[PDB]
Design a protein around this ligand. Structure first.
Ligand SMILES: */C=C\C1=C(C)C(=O)N/C1=C\c1[nH]c(/C=C2\N=C(C[C@H]3NC(=O)C(C(*)=C)=C3C)C(C)=C2CCC(=O)O)c(CCC(=O)O)c1C
Ligand SMILES: */C=C\C1=C(C)C(=O)N/C1=C\c1[nH]c(/C=C2\N=C(C[C@H]3NC(=O)C(C(*)=C)=C3C)C(C)=C2CCC(=O)O)c(CCC(=O)O)c1C
Ligand SMILES: *[C@@H](C)[C@H]1/C(=C/c2[nH]c(/C=C3N=C(/C=C4\NC(=O)C(CC)=C4C)C(C)=C\3CCC(=O)O)c(CCC(=O)O)c2C)NC(=O)[C@@H]1C
Ligand SMILES: *[C@@H](C)[C@H]1/C(=C/c2[nH]c(/C=C3N=C(/C=C4\NC(=O)C(CC)=C4C)C(C)=C\3CCC(=O)O)c(CCC(=O)O)c2C)NC(=O)[C@@H]1C
Ligand SMILES: *[C@@H](C)[C@H]1/C(=C/c2[nH]c(/C=C3N=C(/C=C4\NC(=O)C(CC)=C4C)C(C)=C\3CCC(=O)O)c(CCC(=O)O)c2C)NC(=O)[C@@H]1C
Ligand SMILES: *[C@@H](C)[C@H]1/C(=C/c2[nH]c(/C=C3N=C(/C=C4\NC(=O)C(CC)=C4C)C(C)=C\3CCC(=O)O)c(CCC(=O)O)c2C)NC(=O)[C@@H]1C
Ligand SMILES: *[C@H](C)[C@H]1/C(=C/c2[nH]c(/C=C3N=C(/C=C4\NC(=O)C(CC)=C4C)C(C)=C\3CCC(=O)O)c(CCC(=O)O)c2C)NC(=O)[C@@H]1C
Ligand SMILES: *[C@H](C)[C@H]1/C(=C/c2[nH]c(/C=C3N=C(/C=C4\NC(=O)C(CC)=C4C)C(C)=C\3CCC(=O)O)c(CCC(=O)O)c2C)NC(=O)[C@@H]1C
Lengths: 62, 175, 62, 177
């Protein structure tokens, strides 16, 4: 049966072929396809009060 | 498969795919490079997809935000936006991985019954999913009017159809 | 002189007068101002590649 | 001057100050238009990403040579540094509005900034426009005249607060010109 932990796969994609790297060292090797990385983790989808309040205020505007 | 581990462990541990592993991933799935862009068309727009869909669900039926409505109160609205994002992310992962098994198993199995027990309105859910489906289609095809994605010119109609089919799986499961 | 740490005050406002609370216990006294809280911390403003790529692609649309 | 947040600003280490109850009562009686001021601050912080992206995008759309070779935001690295700065500046302005003074904005953010931009060849005209667009956008959000994304508040007038916010942007403008 489905999970009930409000967790979903969070996909992050990285294309740093322009050579601009982030502060953290590589976590996989990009030998053969420099600059490209796919990251996946399971993260809880947190409640976001600001977004909920904005829909309540703004739903009538496209 | 490297993803399967972190999905199963469901503990925030991340799987990083690069180099020959990435070349391989892209071989296992059709249209590898285009597919990554189609995923990015979703993940780079995730908040807007979710907010536009729930907002549209409400503007078409404002009873949803009136007393006794499905998203009356910030708590309920937030829970609904959460669910929309949860669904969207399992769809995006289905597009990344090329199948709906995780979507079906971890997200959809028992979902209709959950909503039925809570009194969550079926029509509103169906419309939110429908708007997300339409919006994702626009972003994948790069026809969205405000926020586009730069990619080499070409045809992603097959990927767009596949994404739509994942949304149809959500719709079928809740029907 | 100016700092060069790329940090700025991050202000977070909480108005939970509708009674919906977050997972963490109160971190201040609420006596007299029910449901309200002002939080300030200094945080690094991170570079955001996705937003940079979007401006390059989308600047010509309002 | 309000000294509630000075410790967390000085430590600059991610530690947070939480102001509520009696401490919030005090703050809101200290600065002027206390509750309206909190809403005016929210009008900025709840729209921070939009304010920044709209301003930098307007700077470019009015002068697209800025993203072409030799342009101030040519390359993703430069564009991202510019978006970062716009957000840094906006947040020091938002803190000025929260605290009721511009001391931290001037001391920690602006002092030496003109000279830094000069050494790097950051274009002054583009910078002035980005600041100008942020100023106008913040004014619209404070007054709740923005056309797409509004904020629900009790009916009233925040013109004094809007002017004050404008004044903080003017400090940025003064410092960079
Ligand atoms: C974050 C939003 C978007 C950006 C940025 C962008 O460039 N495109 C964006 C969104 C988008 N929406 C749609 C389709 C729909 N959105 C709807 C909700 C909207 N309509 C309303 O009447 C109200 C309430 C006033 C809303 C909040 C609706 C109903 C649709 C159509 C759904 C359908 O076809 O059944 C698309 C796809 C079409 C397009 O490109 O315009 C995008 C990309
Ligand atoms: C997130 C953006 C906004 C939402 C959502 C909303 O409801 N309002 C939003 C922004 C906003 N912008 C402005 C004023 C300006 N924005 C500008 C940049 C824009 N104009 C362009 O030509 C291009 C490139 C094609 C852009 C990206 C500019 C130039 C202005 C005017 C600045 C000036 O007056 O000198 C406002 C304030 C005015 C209004 O309410 O419409 C808001 C709220
Ligand atoms: C230069 C300042 C540009 C920029 C870069 C930037 N990247 C990140 C974060 C990450 N970058 C990667 C990329 C890789 N990791 C690898 O192991 C490999 C080889 C396979 C690549 C290509 C990854 C994985 C991350 C996240 C790391 C993690 O999970 O902890 C940042 C930090 C912000 C972020 O996390 O996205 C930055 C600043 N950003 C820009 O704006 C410049 C254009
Ligand atoms: C439909 C989605 C739109 C579209 C896509 C399209 N993309 C390409 C080519 C490439 N896309 C990438 C991007 C990635 N590869 C990765 O592994 C990852 C994860 C980090 C990403 C983001 C790459 C590397 C290429 C190859 C070219 C390059 O070096 O940039 C094409 C070209 C056709 C092909 O199959 O290669 C197309 C058509 N194009 C559209 O017009 C659609 C709206
Ligand atoms: C109910 C689920 C709604 C909701 C709530 C929500 N709140 C937070 C986080 C915080 N809430 C506060 C509020 C206070 N703390 C206090 O001590 C007092 C009295 C003075 C108040 C009013 C604070 C300080 C936080 C942050 C705590 C921290 O700094 O660690 C969350 C977590 C997310 C966040 O940090 O913003 C949530 C989910 N969210 C919704 O969507 C519902 C409408
Ligand atoms: C200009 C900004 C817009 C505007 C503002 C406005 N606000 C109020 C009244 C209140 N606002 C708050 C909000 C807070 N107090 C806090 O401590 C915090 C931090 C968490 C917030 C967000 C409160 C508590 C009030 C008091 C009234 C109430 O309890 O609802 C007014 C009313 C006049 C006054 O000074 O109280 C106004 C005018 N209103 C507009 O129309 C401007 C667009
Ligand atoms: C938004 C489009 C609609 C809506 C949503 C809504 N959902 C709930 C409650 C739940 N939603 C889920 C769903 C999941 N949990 C998971 O862990 C996963 C997979 C990882 C999914 C898909 C669950 C389990 C619940 C119940 C437990 C919980 O609240 O978290 C609510 C709250 C209903 C209530 O009365 O309490 C709402 C509002 N509601 C609508 O009206 C929209 C059509
Ligand atoms: C965007 C509107 C404009 C723009 C910006 C731009 N800025 C830089 C570089 C720097 N910006 C700062 C600013 C600060 N650092 C801080 O720590 C603080 C206070 C906390 C501020 C205000 C600094 C110190 C630098 C230099 C060091 C660094 O890169 O971080 C760049 C990069 C310029 C380059 O050539 O490397 C850019 C692009 N550029 C424009 O064209 C817009 C007008």
């Amino acid at each position: 049966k489905m999970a009930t932990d409000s967790k979903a796969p969070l996909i992050e994609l990285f294309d740093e072929r322009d050579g601009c790297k982030g502060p953290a060292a590589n976590k996989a090797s990009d030998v053969g396809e420099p600059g490209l990385c796919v990251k996946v983790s399971m993260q809880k989808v947190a409640m976001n009060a600001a977004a909920a309040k904005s829909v309540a205020t703004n739903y009538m505007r496209k | 498969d490297a993803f399967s581990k972190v999905i199963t462990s469901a503990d925030g541990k991340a799987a990083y795919v690069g180099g020959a592993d990435l070349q391989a991933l892209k071989k296992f799935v059709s249209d590898g490079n285009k597919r990554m862009d189609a995923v990015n068309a979703i993940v780079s727009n995730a908040s807007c997809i979710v907010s536009d869909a729930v907002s549209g669900m409400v503007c078409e039926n404002p009873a949803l935000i009136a007393p006794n409505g499905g998203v009356y109160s910030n708590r309920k609205m937030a829970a609904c936006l959460r669910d929309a994002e949860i669904i969207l992310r399992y769809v995006s992962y289905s597009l990344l991985s090329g199948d709906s098994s995780v979507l079906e198993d971890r997200c959809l199995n028992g979902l209709k019954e959950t909503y039925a027990s809570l009194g969550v309105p079926a029509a509103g859910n169906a419309r939110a999913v429908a708007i997300m489906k339409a919006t994702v289609n626009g972003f994948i095809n790069n026809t969205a009017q405000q926020k586009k994605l730069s990619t080499p010119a070409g045809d992603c109609s097959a990927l767009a159809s596949e994404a739509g089919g994942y949304f149809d799986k959500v719709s079928s499961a809740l029907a």
